[PDB]
Symmetry: C3
Subunit: 151 residues, 3 copies
C-alpha cells in the first residue's frame, strides 16, 4: 500500500523533471545545435583540419557530422549556413581511393554529392566537406573546415 | 514484494537525476543564460538586425527577449552588461506607429523607457533596444544589436 | 495489484529521461566543458582579472577551477590547451603569504607547481595560473586570465 503511494510520488517528480528538461533542451541547442530525429549536431564554432576535428568529436564522446538522410543533411546545412562556413563530414576514402566509408568502415547509405564529385582533385582529396548549399565535395583533409560533431 | 526493491531502485534513479539535472542547469546557463521565474534568457553572443534576430529565436523554439517585469528586465540586463552590447527586444510598433506590441499582438504590460523615449527619431524607429543601463530606446530595426532569446 | 504495471511504466519514463539527459550532457560539454568524476569544468571562453573571474563563477552557482588531483588537473588542462590561454585557479595565498588555500580557507591537498614556483615574484603574486603544459605558477591577481568555473 505504501508502495502505491511511493509510486505516485515518483510520478510527480518525474513529470517535473520531464517538463523542466524539455525547456533546457531548447535553451542548450541555441544557437549552435540542431536536433533531427534522435540525432543532435553541434558545431564548435571554429575551423580545424580533419584530423584535429575528428579527435575533438571523438574525445567529446561523439563523432564528426555524418548525415545519413536528406533530413539530417538539411539539419546540418542549417548550421553551416548560420556560420557561413563549410564543414567536414566524418567520411573518407583514405583506406581505398574512391570508396568512401564512415569511421566504422561501412559504406555510405546516403550522399549528396555535387555534380561530378567526388573527383579526387589533384589526386589528393580524401575528406568530404558540405557546402552552404548542402552539396558534398571531396576535399584535401589538410584544409580547415567548420567543426560539427554529432551526438 | 520484489516490487519493493524495484521501487527503491527507481527512487534512487530519480534522486540521482534530480541532482544531476540541477548541476547541469548551472553549467548550461554559464555564461550566456539567465533564469528568472519560469523564463530563461540566452544570448547568441553576437549581433544581428531585427528581422534576422527574430528569425533565429523563432526557429530555435523561442522568441526575442520580452521582459514583462522589473525582475525579467534586470535578468536580461545582466546579459547585456556582461557582453557590453545593447540588445533588441521583441516588441515593435511597426504596424501602428506609437503603439508598441509583442510578437503575439497584445499591447505592452510593462515598459522601462529611457527619459524622452520612445521618440521615433527620424520618423523611423520601430524596434526596441535595451541599454546596458537597463533602459529601453526605440531604434531603427535595421541596426545590428545583441541577439538574446527567451525560452 | 496493477502497481506492478505502474512501476513498469515509470521504469520506462525514467530510463527514457536517463538516455536523453546523457545525450544532452555530452552535447553541453562540447567544446567548452570537461567532466571528471562528479565535477564539471566549463570555460567562459574569455579572460578576466581574478576578482572579476571569481565573481562570475560564484554568481553562476559554482567557483573558480580548483583541481584537487592529477585527474582533475589534466581535465582542466584540456580546456586551457583548447583555448591556448592560461587560466586562473581559485586558490590564493592572500591571507598568509606562502600558504595557498581554497576559497573555504583549507590548505591545498594537491599542487602542480612548475619548477621554481611558487616564488611570489616581485613581492606580489598571490593568485595561481595553470599553463598550457598543466603546471602552476603564482601570478599577480590583477592579470587577466581564462575564466574556468567548476560545478
Ligand atoms: O579546391 C578544390 C575544389 O575546387 C573546385 O571547387 C570549387 C567549385 O567548383 C566552385 O563553384 C565553388 O563551389 C561553391 C558552389 O558553387 C556553391 O554552390 C556552394 O554554396 O559553395 C561552394 C564552395 O565555395 O568553390 C569550390 C572550391 O571551394 C572543384 O569543383 C572541387 O571538386 C575541388 O575539390
Ligand atoms: O541613434 C538614434 C538614437 O540617438 C539618441 O540616443 C543616444 C543617447 O542620447 C546617448 O546618451 C547615448 O545613450 C546611452 C545612455 O546615455 C547610457 O546611459 C546607456 O548605458 O547607453 C546608451 C547607449 O550608448 O547613445 C544613444 C545612441 O546609441 C536618442 O536619444 C535616441 O532616442 C535615438 O533613437
Ligand atoms: O610574469 C611573472 C612571471 O615571470 C616568469 O614566468 C615566465 C616563465 O619564466 C617563461 O618560461 C614562460 O613560462 C611558460 C612555460 O615555460 C611553458 O612550459 C608553459 O606551457 O607556458 C608558460 C607561460 O607562457 O612565461 C612565463 C610568464 O608568463 C617567472 O618564472 C614566474 O615565476 C613569474 O610569475
Ligand atoms: Ca587517396
Ligand atoms: Ca580520394
Ligand atoms: Ca572535389
Ligand atoms: Ca513607424
Ligand atoms: Ca516608431
Ligand atoms: Ca529613440
Ligand atoms: Ca602576498
Ligand atoms: Ca604570494
Ligand atoms: Ca611566480
Amino acid at each position: 500500500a505504501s508502495l502505491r503511494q511511493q509510486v505516485e510520488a515518483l510520478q510527480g517528480q518525474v513529470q517535473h523533471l520531464q517538463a523542466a528538461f524539455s525547456q533546457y533542451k531548447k535553451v542548450e541547442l541555441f544557437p549552435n545545435g540542431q536536433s533531427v530525429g534522435e540525432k543532435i549536431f553541434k558545431t564548435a564554432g571554429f575551423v580545424k583540419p580533419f584530423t584535429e576535428a575528428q579527435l575533438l568529436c571523438t574525445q567529446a564522446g561523439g563523432q564528426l557530422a555524418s548525415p545519413r538522410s536528406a533530413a539530417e543533411n538539411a539539419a546540418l546545412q542549417q548550421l553551416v549556413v548560420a556560420k557561413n562556413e563549410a564543414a567536414f563530414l566524418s567520411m573518407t576514402d583514405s583506406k581505398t581511393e574512391g570508396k568512401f566509408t564512415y569511421p566504422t568502415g561501412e559504406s555510405l547509405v546516403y550522399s549528396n554529392w555535387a555534380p561530378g564529385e567526388p573527383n579526387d582533385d589533384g589526386g589528393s582529396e580524401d575528406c568530404v566537406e558540405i557546402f552552404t548549399n548542402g552539396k558534398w565535395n571531396d576535399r584535401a583533409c589538410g584544409e580547415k573546415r567548420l567543426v560539427v560533431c554529432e551526438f
